[PDB]
Design a protein around this ligand. Structure first.
Ligand SMILES: C[Se]C[C@H]1O[C@H](O)[C@H](O)[C@@H]1O
Length: 333
């Protein structure tokens, strides 16, 4: 019936609240969706959101963060910050009075005022790689698509190694993957050469730990006539949904969180911090397992936004949705 008042620290601010988002990747589909979610949520709240991508170059990541600190942004969001530098970088953000939330970032210890956010990487693995195990009855020659050194990657690899220990008839032939400006093409080329080393019958499945990798493997399977190999992925994007619907498509499952929600929630967290509202030390997003047959059953293409119509509760959460967000949205549009 009545309107929740805008918190004073937002109401009294000189000009727009300004947020910097620095993500340690290039323009892959996951990234593209994450940035879209931060931007949309910030726009809802009347915030200026400035976004920066390092292309995976940790030096450029650091320079971007350091410049945002010097510019005195009201808040900062980091994504995919690595060791060794991310902890001291975040400590410097906090020391400068800048509100901060991080996603998939390496943080040692407890930094007061920080929220650290992540997906349930063990569950992403158990559901995706575990489907592979179930489908092959514990016996398969696989390729893994994976890159070292990122927090989600190291947690997925630990969960994966536990499943290999449980199922000794799963043989990892090779692991492939790098971050570059063309992950799809690079992966596709690399998978093409692995396909040449292990002809038809010698590979059963591929586990892709990031859908940028799986997209490239998919292209390689199609172009090389190797669609007898089945694909199991983490992440989702509009492209992946189309690929699961193509003729002869080997893309069996994606286990995923909507990256737009991840972006939005990190914004919500920074908004609460600027407002002076309690926020937790940690927060974990929950994923859904998306089977190919679901998508094949639809009457035409489905985008990620559309998944809510066929996956109850997809991409939605009330977590950190303060009642004054509605007020701000009205005060802006
Ligand atoms: C090279 Se890090 C790529 C991963 O970051 C996020 O956790 C997404 O799930 C994507 O798989």
């Amino acid at each position: 019936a009545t309107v929740a008042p805008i918190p004073d620290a937002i109401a009294k601010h000189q000009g727009q609240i300004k947020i910097a988002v620095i993500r340690n990747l290039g323009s892959d589909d996951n990234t593209t969706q994450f940035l879209s979610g931060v931007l949309k949520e910030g726009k809802k709240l009347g915030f200026k959101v400035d976004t920066f991508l390092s292309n995976g170059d940790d030096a450029r990541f650091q320079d971007f963060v350091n410049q945002a600190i010097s510019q005195k942004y009201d808040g900062i969001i980091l994504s995919q910050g690595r060791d060794p530098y991310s902890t001291e970088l975040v400590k410097r953000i906090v020391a400068n009075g800048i509100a901060v939330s991080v996603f998939d970032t390496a943080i040692q210890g407890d930094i007061p005022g920080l929220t650290v956010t992540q997906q349930d990487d063990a569950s992403l693995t158990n559901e995706s790689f575990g489907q592979l195990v179930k489908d092959f009855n514990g016996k398969a020659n696989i390729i893994k698509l994976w890159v070292a050194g990122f927090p989600p990657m190291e947690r997925r690899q630990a969960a994966y190694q536990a499943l290999l220990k449980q199922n000794p008839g799963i043989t990892e032939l090779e692991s492939i993957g790098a971050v570059s400006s063309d992950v799809q093409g690079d992966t596709a080329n690399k998978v093409g050469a692995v396909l040449a080393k292990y002809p038809k019958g010698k590979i059963d499945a591929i586990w892709g730990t990031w859908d940028a990798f799986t997209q490239g493997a998919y292209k390689a399977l199609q172009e090389n006539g190797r669609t007898e190999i089945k694909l199991y992925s983490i992440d989702i994007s509009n492209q992946d949904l189309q690929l699961m619907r193509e003729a002869n498509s080997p893309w069996k499952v994606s286990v995923a969180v909507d990256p737009k929600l991840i972006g939005a929630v990190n914004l919500r967290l920074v908004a609460k911090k600027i407002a002076g509202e309690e926020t937790p030390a940690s927060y974990e997003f929950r994923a859904a397992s998306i089977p190919q047959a679901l998508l094949v059953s639809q009457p035409g293409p489905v985008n990620v936004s559309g998944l809510s119509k066929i996956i109850p509760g997809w991409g939605q959460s009330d977590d950190f949705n303060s009642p004054w967000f509605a007020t701000l949205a009205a005060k802006n549009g």
